[PDB]
Symmetry: D2
Subunit: 481 residues, 4 copies
Amino acid sequence: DTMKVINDPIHGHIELHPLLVRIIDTPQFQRLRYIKQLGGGYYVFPGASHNRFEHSLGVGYLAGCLVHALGEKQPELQISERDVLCVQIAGLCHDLGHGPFSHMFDGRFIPLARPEVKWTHEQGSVMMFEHLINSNGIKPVMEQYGLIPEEDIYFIKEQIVGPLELWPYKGRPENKSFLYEIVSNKRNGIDVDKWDYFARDCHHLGIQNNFDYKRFIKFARVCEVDNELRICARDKEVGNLYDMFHTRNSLHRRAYQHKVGNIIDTMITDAFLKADDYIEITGAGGKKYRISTAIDDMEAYTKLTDNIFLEILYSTDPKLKDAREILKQIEYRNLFKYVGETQPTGQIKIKREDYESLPKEVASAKPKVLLDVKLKAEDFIVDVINMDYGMQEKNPIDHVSFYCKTAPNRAIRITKNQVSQLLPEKFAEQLIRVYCKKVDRKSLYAARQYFVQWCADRNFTKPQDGDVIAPLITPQKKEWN
Amino acid sequence: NLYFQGSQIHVDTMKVINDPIHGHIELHPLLVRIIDTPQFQRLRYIKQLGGGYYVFPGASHNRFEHSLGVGYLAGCLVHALGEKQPELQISERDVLCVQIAGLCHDLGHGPFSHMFDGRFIPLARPEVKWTHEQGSVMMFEHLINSNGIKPVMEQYGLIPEEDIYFIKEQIVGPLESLWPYKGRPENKSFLYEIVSNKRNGIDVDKWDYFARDCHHLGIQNNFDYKRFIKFARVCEVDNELRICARDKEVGNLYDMFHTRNSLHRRAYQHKVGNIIDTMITDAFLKADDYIEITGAGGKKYRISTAIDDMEAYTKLTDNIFLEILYSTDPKLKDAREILKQIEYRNLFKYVGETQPTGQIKIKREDYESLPKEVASAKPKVLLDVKLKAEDFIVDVINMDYGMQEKNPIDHVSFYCKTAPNRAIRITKNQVSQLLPEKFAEQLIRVYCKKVDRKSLYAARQYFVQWCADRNFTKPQDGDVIAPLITPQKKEWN
Amino acid sequence: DTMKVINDPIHGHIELHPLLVRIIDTPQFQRLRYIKQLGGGYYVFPGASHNRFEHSLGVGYLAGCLVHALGEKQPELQISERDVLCVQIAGLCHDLGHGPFSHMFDGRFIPLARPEVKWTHEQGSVMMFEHLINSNGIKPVMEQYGLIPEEDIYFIKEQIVGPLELWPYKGRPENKSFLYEIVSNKRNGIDVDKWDYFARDCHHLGIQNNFDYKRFIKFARVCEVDNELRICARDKEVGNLYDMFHTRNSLHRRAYQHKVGNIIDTMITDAFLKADDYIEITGAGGKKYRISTAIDDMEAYTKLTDNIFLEILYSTDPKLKDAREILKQIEYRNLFKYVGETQPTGQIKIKREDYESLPKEVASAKPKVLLDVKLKAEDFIVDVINMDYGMQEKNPIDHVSFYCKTAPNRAIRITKNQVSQLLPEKFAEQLIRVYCKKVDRKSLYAARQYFVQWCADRNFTKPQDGDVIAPLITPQKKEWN
Amino acid sequence: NLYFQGSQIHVDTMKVINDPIHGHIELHPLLVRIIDTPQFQRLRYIKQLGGGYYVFPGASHNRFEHSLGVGYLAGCLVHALGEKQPELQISERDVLCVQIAGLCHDLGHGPFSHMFDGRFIPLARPEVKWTHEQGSVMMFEHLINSNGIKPVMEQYGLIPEEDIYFIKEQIVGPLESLWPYKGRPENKSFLYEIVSNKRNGIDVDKWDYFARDCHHLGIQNNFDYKRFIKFARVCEVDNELRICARDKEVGNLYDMFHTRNSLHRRAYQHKVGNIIDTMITDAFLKADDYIEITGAGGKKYRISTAIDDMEAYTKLTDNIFLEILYSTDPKLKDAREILKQIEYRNLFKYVGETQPTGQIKIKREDYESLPKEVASAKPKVLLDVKLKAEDFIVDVINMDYGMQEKNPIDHVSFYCKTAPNRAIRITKNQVSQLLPEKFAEQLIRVYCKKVDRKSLYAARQYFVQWCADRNFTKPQDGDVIAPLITPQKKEWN
Ligand SMILES: Nc1nc2c(ncn2[C@H]2C[C@H](O)[C@@H](COP(=O)(O)OP(=O)(O)OP(=O)(O)O)O2)c(=O)[nH]1
Ligand SMILES: Nc1ncnc2c1ncn2[C@H]1C[C@H](O)[C@@H](COP(=O)(O)OP(=O)(O)OP(=O)(O)O)O1
Ligand SMILES: Nc1ncnc2c1ncn2[C@H]1C[C@H](O)[C@@H](COP(=O)(O)OP(=O)(O)OP(=O)(O)O)O1
Ligand SMILES: [Mg+2]
Ligand SMILES: [Mg+2]
Ligand SMILES: [Mg+2]
Ligand SMILES: [Mg+2]
Ligand SMILES: [Zn+2]
Ligand SMILES: [Zn+2]
Ligand SMILES: [Zn+2]
Ligand SMILES: [Zn+2]
């Protein structure tokens, strides 16, 4: 068996070692052809037809690119072909755990269907990777190509999900710490996963990418920090790294958190909840699973992809009628109506245990207006969006090591004020979107009054269309004028 | 709300869609009403390039976004012609009609696009005459009737009986068997040259797919449609007003068809993409008796019969692949097994490619007889295995410039700088001596369904022997794959 | 005479009305083929070979694009073909006044050579446009195509430089105020000049553009503000407009203010100063002009382009030897050495009348270090760079009018806090770069100590390489650790 | 500073350059030393496409950035081959030598590139044999000697006497008149196939200019060089180790030469770009006696003689155009007048294009006689004016696949999947019946130096009459420009 070359529109011709080919050509990996990267986003951005499969090839490719580059520049690091393969495998497999419509599944559906489970796609990736290895006899193939399955499988899993349990990793020692900063960088978020998705999502969405990952690679080195050898960037690249996070935030603003993309994800999630009792997916030993329980059995989960949307849409089962009706409303573009967007003022954070109480609050607001209809808590959706630099309140650049021209082997730190005074004052905020499920002219006008009144009551920011939509409400607030 | 000339104005709010190919596309509300139906949205679930995605991972794109693009460009070209030549009397009505035809021209595609009408339906139901274009007409009629579009059409100045007919003609051509069109008369003949140009193949369908397939495949587009639009005019030709291109664009038009042929060679006819389409087709044939799709009046249809009922066909998309793959029914085991072999990349093995020599053409009626011929070859090679007709697949590919043996540029009208309203013709020899001497050829690919090392070695011998026997061209790897056969054919050396 | 089509790599096929063609095909316009858009930038970014000529075609094109779009959407505005042509002409001609190496000439050279003159390229554009009109008989051609030369020439000039002297414009009334917001927008800086240069500079530099001007055009309308009809953007486009200015700032950071690009511009300026007495350029009536005085005579200025660099480089005149030597040092890449970069702390601004005193201050600093050499004020260059959002301290988005979906004809305002809390706290800052003209190992080490000591003394920010370059200096400052 | 294996390591700091075509290019310090000289930096002041910039405003790019690109790709390809095949014993020394040849291959270009050696020098000094490639060898020798490069070469493991010779051979070919190279022996023959491939024209020079010219011109590149690199290997062929391409890449290689021909048709041979080059050449001829360029020992040279002294040639760039345009000397008035006419766009008028018929070829020795022939035509048309030989320009353009009448793919070696070390040949008929039947042709363009309406009308008649007389092909606008002539030629209808 020989290597294969794959032509990718983002990266061009990607070479795949035959061990990678064996892993790719399995039902557990090919499954990713059937899960859209951006989920409901495709229903707003028609170019965003791309699936997790090709993203995963790109992450595999870039992981190998970066590790090879570091090795070529610093032979003293003793990066081996074995190391390169392990990093490539982690890149290829980091997203094996995604479910139907990607973020929607672990971000919206599972928390609603089964509030007690701890589920993240990353956890799913580890479990699916284990299932892929065992179901396809990969361990002997790994051995043939110089890998040590016991150590290296563990290493791959650590690269994907982080520590499985002082140096907290077992797959590789401290003098190879930099290898853990490639696929999923828990220290500062600078990883090849982002580099592929910035480039790939932009290609498909029709928005242009301003981050240059190849430049980052050219300027990346390995430096000693504490007892570890870590990735270090050239000092004057700091501005580019701030802009990388800006880019990430803009893509969330323009595309990933698009108000309509999010409402479509919400409606699909609703249909899945209404279908969940009635859809059967066969797992190991012929056991039957639900959409929400397939995550417990990797054989069942293998067969759980975006196909579930069409299974529901095409169904005739009267038990599936409620679910089916919601999907039919998407097709006719009878979506829940966007009422508006607001933000908390001051240093107030909205806590996750409070999200479910918010539609109640909006319905319980008292707009001093001639209201032709009354709306209830169930008529409202309140979507709270956490926008940050990937580390809650923290500045990720405070967790980057740099090197200088005249001492390329010496790590230094660079603070925010050493860079620019035009950078963000803080690194996390919340956006609150409100929609109304009742879509007639009179319910919508009413929904607007409740919403803006609620913003007033909570001392939230004034909606941008506030004076046009709720003119009898905005004057009452003098903080807004 | 607002008034103009003393009358309330019904302002048409346009939706804007951001497309990676065309950028921001504005959609008139009538187009939006057509788009937001189950019959149109269906196209989100049918890959443009079908099995091609399994070879080119960027080619995830579906017929939906291609269709928006074709609608957009159709409008672009008609608008450009009308702004340059007000005397054509192109109306907003005409523009909407051409946009609608562009939007809807591919409504009739089935699962995996080309695979469905090109491979599956001809094998499943050999006596039906089905094309995706026919399917588009039927699906469009169904879309209109199921969603109450006719009043909306009238609201925006269309005359539905005339205009629906015109739209259908744009998609499929004349609706019968003099001027053959009823939707529009001869002084608007050019309107039929926009979405699907039957005269010479220069249409906006090609323009979108060149750009979009290239974007996704990771191959670069070398044709510039915007330039063509800039240089397009309308000229009187044989009692019609037809599209006419600037004379000096002739080289670019030859290159347009060269691009199309390159895209077929590199991507659409990729040997492995084709074998994947072939395997999916085989699975569908195996599943065909056992899949039920509910149509109108609750009637049940098969994959192959859903084309007879648009309510059922509405629900027939690439999803059928996963329905088969995920199935548990023992009746579906054979179909399911084939799709599983695709996932493991246990594909039929490519043996090679050859072509006929002289002016010999392989007849369509003889395709079925070819695997028998390969299996009946007698290679003077000692082999471990014997292969039968059923072990061979023979795929005959017709590569041309869209009009069989004919040069499409012979059917293009041109104008010259100093007389922009006068149509002329330009012959091949007036352009370049480096252009093709003929405009159609056949490629013959051979595969083996037995995939082990011994069987493939044997298939290579049967194949090259057959090529020698039939005086086909020497396979490119002939010296290496069949050293006991190739040196013995005197016309190969 | 017919229109012409030009193929441009940024905009594709641009149609040029025959009146535009007549203006383009003159020595005053074709001159722009010989002036690099980015000046010394080409010596750092080898793709940046592009000239002001093709940029000017693109600005002409986009100006026509925007005016046509507004007219098509709002016929009630009565935008005529005459208006479109006048706006296109202003777009084509807005940069006629640029001199050798663009920004370098009016930004660095003229202020040094002739400190008493008021010179800006925009002023030069008006003067060159007048010279183009008069020298090429354009007024009858304007008349032939429906223009009113007296009114329309004035209008074009106003679009380029602003008011030539309540409604302050004479070329067009208040109900066509939006026409003054196309080529050079003095109100908020949102204009087609930026749109071309973002796209074009990015194409050549090898950095990707993230601003979508075509999207802006799709969402642009004309709304009533006070007594004027002004350009108004859709409310939810506000984030994109903040990002437009971010983009502008990033391009300045990465490319236009590149530390080496700036030092090359500085050296070229020095050579021009040393050549200025000795270069003769023939103007009207055969009068002779200098590099610095050609700006006084448009006939002379017509012949003043990047060619002056090579005239100096290729010269044999012993009077030009000093100038020639500086250019020869550029060729051999013997450039002044970058010592570092710093910023003022607090709300301190460095005033323009203080720039010339700064090399003195650096030389007068007292580093408590074993210094192997002493450097003087003339050994130092101190480049102060003003980075802002185009309106000094002000937020340009406070000067943008918006419209909402449910009232497309009603202008509103949107404040910073209504948008995002991750946006800049302020909109202007200063960067201070220091270089040393003495390029040996010992002078450079010394230069570093003077520089960092000076930063300490002034309470400027700590240089990013501060601890590596000046380790015996950084500890003294506790504000830095 | 730092140590490794008990020895201080002289770390080679690489400069990085951001190029819009190739992205971030790393330059070894030896390459940097060569780049940072007046002889190299000179290339910043010579436009790649010369007069083409006056038709395509994006084509502002210069030979400098193209040269960096060629250096980069040369290194890329040699590195790729060496990593795939360690048995070739490609050393860092070899890699640097190929990079240096790539960097320096165009050092000999003059003002406006092709215009200078293609048009100007042949007219100014008909007996000299000058090519830009010869100029590159001379300029490289001058660069090395004037900047003390030989010690730097030794510092990085080069053997200057061997390696300078090798570099020169890469640029210009054999340095004399068996194995014809001294720089490297037969087991490194493939190294001569990288920068300037004399065997078949597949080299990295083309790869850079395809990508870069397209980027600037606003036409899209359809050739994928990175793919070619992925599929390139080294194979034994006739006692040499040569580059060999994967068999299935043959279609892409035919398309590479098709792309080159398209770029010549669309851009490099644009009728107006060519007439602008012609006018600039005319100005240079008029100025040639009066421009002085100081060379070595203070000797004075002309534009046409600067090629004889590299110190003077160093100072001869596109700047000569502006020196003429800005001049005040009355001796330069005629030259200056021509450049002024370019600025006002008072260009010579294009009359038309034709080609020979049959296998008739126009001989180079007969080009000079052609304007006389056009002026000696006798159109049966009543005209206001009479035109003489001096009023006509006849530009004969040779369009081929780089090897005159020969198919370059006949000189490419291929390998097959199942035997990657074995070289094979692939013939045209093994590929496609739609490929060119011949590989060279001539285009004949005619212009008139008299630009008024009456003179152009007349020129059109003389031209078409001449085409008829010589049995050349019918001009594409013949029906429109010469209705009194065209219908009377029976082989044109
Ligand atoms: N390039 C780009 N495209 C965007 C951006 N935001 C949305 N899009 C895309 C998604 C859609 O395909 C198209 C229209 O989206 P919009 O957000 O403008 O429309 P939407 O219907 O959500 O808003 P509306 O009903 O007008 O309030 O543009 C953006 O910031 N940049
Ligand atoms: N001409 C082409 N240009 C660009 N990409 C191509 C071209 N032909 C094929 N591809 C793509 C499809 C695949 O993603 C990748 C590899 O395809 P290809 O080289 O045809 O492999 P193959 O596996 O079909 O042939 P083989 O097994 O004989 O090497 O390149
Ligand atoms: N095939 C092509 N593809 C893309 N751009 C082209 C092509 N040919 C020419 N161009 C460019 C060069 C110019 O910028 C622009 C116009 O060129 P062209 O159409 O050839 O005008 P022209 O003025 O030479 O011919 P004419 O006067 O006969 O109309 O398009
Ligand atoms: Mg293969
Ligand atoms: Mg909307
Ligand atoms: Mg022309
Ligand atoms: Mg440097
Ligand atoms: Zn990922
Ligand atoms: Zn189509
Ligand atoms: Zn400008
Ligand atoms: Zn070259």
